Amino acid sequence: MQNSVIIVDKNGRLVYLVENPGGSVANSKAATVTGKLVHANFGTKKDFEDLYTPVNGSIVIVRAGKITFAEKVANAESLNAIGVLIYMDQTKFPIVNAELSFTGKGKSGIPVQTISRAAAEKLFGNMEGDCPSDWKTDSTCRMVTSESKNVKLTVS
Ligand code: NA
């Protein structure tokens, strides 16, 4: 299956298959990107200001809420992110029929994929850094992938 999120080594070879998500983000660009994965909470501008790790060239994972998916992606894109992962912490069930409205430049320049909660926790288990307490996130939450690992996103 193409639509997939994979944890790869520095050669791009699979180390863990995180998910082959069933749903597909409407209006997302088709691309295969690889980079460090960075948690940006809800993807609001304040959350990105809260980051200590550079967004430039990384894949961003945000949870649903507060703002539209498009606003999250636009915030990540503005900071030179290469891709976005969206999940829901409140339930195990997937985001159904994800769609992007229009903000900023009016089109999503970077690939966007929704993933299940179990997939996100799979990613957090392979990431480093405890999430800020003000985020009120689950204890599983983690901020960044370590040096040893990178995430590969393949969309549509
Ligand atoms: Na950070």
CA distance 22 to 52: 32
Output DSSP code: residue 99. B
| DSSP string covering 40-74 | -TT--HHHHHH-SS--TT-EEEEESBSB-HHHHHH
Q: How far is the CA of 19 from the centre of ligand 1 (A)?
A: 23
Residue 5: count of CB within 10 angstroms of its CB: 26
* Ligand 1 mean position, distance from CA 79 (Å): 13
User: 1 CA distance to ligand 1 centroid (A)?
Assistant: 31
Contact call for residues 62 and 84 (beta carbons, < 8 A): yes
Residues 6+ apart with CB under 8 A from 30: 111, 155, 156
Distance 51 CA to ligand 1 centre (A): 4
- By what method was this entry solved? X-ray
CA of 53 relative to ligand 1 center, distance in Å: 4
**Interior/surface letters 58-94, b for 16+ CB within 10 angstroms, e for the rest:** bbbbbbbeebebbbbbbbbbebebbbbbbbbbeeeeb
**How far does the centroid of ligand 1 lie from the alpha carbon of residue 128, in Å?**
10
- Which residue has tokens 């200590």? 52
Question: Would you say 106 and 75 are in contact if contact means Cβ atoms under 8 Å apart?
Answer: no
> Residue 85 C-alpha to ligand 1 middle, in angstroms?
16
Q: Are 114 and 62 in contact (CB under 8 A)?
A: no
The amino acid at residue 57 is G
49 Cβ neighbours under 8 A, 6+ residues apart: none
CA distances from 4 to 9, 54, 156 (A): 16, 24, 10
Using DSSP's 3-state secondary structure scheme, residue 69 falls into helix
Residue 143 Cα to ligand 1 middle (Å): 5
CA of 144 to the centre of ligand 1 (A): 6
Half-sphere exposure of 66 (CA within 13 A, CB side): 14
Number of H helices, E strands in the chain: 3, 10
Residue 2's domain spans which residues?
1-156
Beta carbons within 8 Å of 21's beta carbon, 6+ residues apart: 3, 4, 5, 94, 113, 114, 115, 116, 119
Q: What is the CA radius of gyration of the chain?
A: 14
Cα 114–Cα 41–Cα 85 angle in degrees, nearest 5: 20
Specify the amino acid at residue 51.
L
Q: How many angstroms does the Cα of residue 48 sit away from the middle of ligand 1?
A: 9
Count of structural domains within the chain: 1
